[PDB]
Design an enzyme around this catalytic site. Sequence first.
Site: not given
Ligand SMILES: [Zn+2]
Length: 258
Positions: A62, A117, A197
């Site tokens: 992902h 991130h 997520t």
């Molecule tokens: Zn992230």
Amino acid sequence: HHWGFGKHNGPEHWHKDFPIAKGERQSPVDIDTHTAKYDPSLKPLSVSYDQATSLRILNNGHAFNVEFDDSQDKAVLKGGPLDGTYRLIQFHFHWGSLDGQGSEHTVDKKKYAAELHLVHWNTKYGDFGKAVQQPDGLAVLGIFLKVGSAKPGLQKVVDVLDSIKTKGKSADFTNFDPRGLLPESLDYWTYPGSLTTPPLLECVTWIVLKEPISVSSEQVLKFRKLNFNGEGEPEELMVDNWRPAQPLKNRQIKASFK
Ligand SMILES: [Zn+2]
């Protein structure tokens, strides 16, 4: 069959397997710069990445993560709204299929081409697995990327993407300095949120930098060549791996600047 960013397993579906998706402190959110409150009590951020030790870079299906050695306080985040020391464990990005989308957080509804991130965990809880079960377990530094001039410090990451094109692939990635990905200013907003997520745990203190960092169209294009699928499977391009903004609910976004 599992969660993803397709049409039949996208963010709108996640709640069926992860009920917390409709929780009270979900991320990302839209940052409304006029409703955000300046908090004089917030101390400057303290980023100590001089001893950071990157180890590997992997395509987890992902996104791609750049993993660091977190067995000691080599790369840590302190100060700001945080209480204690948070160790850097990995960083990753979310990006779109077009330059007009890709970021998870938005600023006054404005979307950026991508969002970086940098994930850190609270050392008091001993390890990452334990930290995600606590309300103050994680601190995530979010940085916006806009398309313009190339970012020299990001090229090393861009060049190795070919070696981890498909899900499950990993490659040695040592001596990478994350300091080359930081903007000049460290002014930020902060609010209590979650991991964006599955399994969407609400253990995150979010620290979103105000100043974006510029990357070239060529650099972002290489992100879009990655695959969600594993080798030998039908190609699906890894694009639009971002979750839409969630309801702010009973939360206040604070700013370190006015
Ligand atoms: Zn992230």
